[PDB]
Amino acid sequence: KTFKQRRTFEQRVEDVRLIREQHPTKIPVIIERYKGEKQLPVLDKTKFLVPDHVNMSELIKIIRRRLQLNANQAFFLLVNGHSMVSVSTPISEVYESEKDEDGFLYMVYASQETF
Ligand SMILES: CCNC(=O)c1c[nH]nn1
Ligand SMILES: [Cl-]
Known part of the structure; x- marks a missing residue:
């Protein structure tokens, strides 16, 4: 079901290394709907290449x-x-301090703040 359940640790690590090689200015982001969520729709895709200069607000x-x-x-x-402490932080900084060990940046969204 989830991204981590679909791909092995080995597969996730290698895919992050390919994005480093082919899209070196991009942050590899996993964006997933909360498993509880009722109101918001699902995205058309899971894996996103985000320009490393945009902040969390953008x-x-x-x-x-x-x-x-x-x-x-x-x-x-x-x-x-x-929760993000601040939306003003550039995703490049956010990535360095919040990346998973597989090298992806994992995000989850909902209509409730109490997930
Ligand atoms: C199938 C739904 N697709 C979208 O809403 C979308 C937005 N950007 N690319 N695809
Ligand atoms: Cl690039």
């Missing part, structure tokens, strides 16, 4: 546009299992 805007949300749908983005 990634939230990007994802809200990709889900085709409207002005008054709530949207909450967890990173590496927890």
Whole structure:
């Protein structure tokens, strides 16, 4: 079901190494809907290459546009299992401190802030 369940540790590590080689300015991001979630739709895909210069505030805007949300749908983005302290941080910095050991950056979204 989940990304980690679909691919082996070995496969996830190698895929991150291929993105390093072919798309060196990109952050490899896994974005998954909360398993509880009722209101928001699922994304068309799981794996995203995010320009390393955009901050978390712009990634939230990007994802809200990709889900085709409207002005008054709530949207909450967890990173590496927890709330973001700040949305102003560049994803390059966020990546260095929050990356998984497989080298992906894992995110989960919901309409409730209480996941
Ligand atoms: C099948 C739904 N597709 C989308 O909503 C989308 C957005 N960007 N690329 N695809
Ligand atoms: Cl690149």
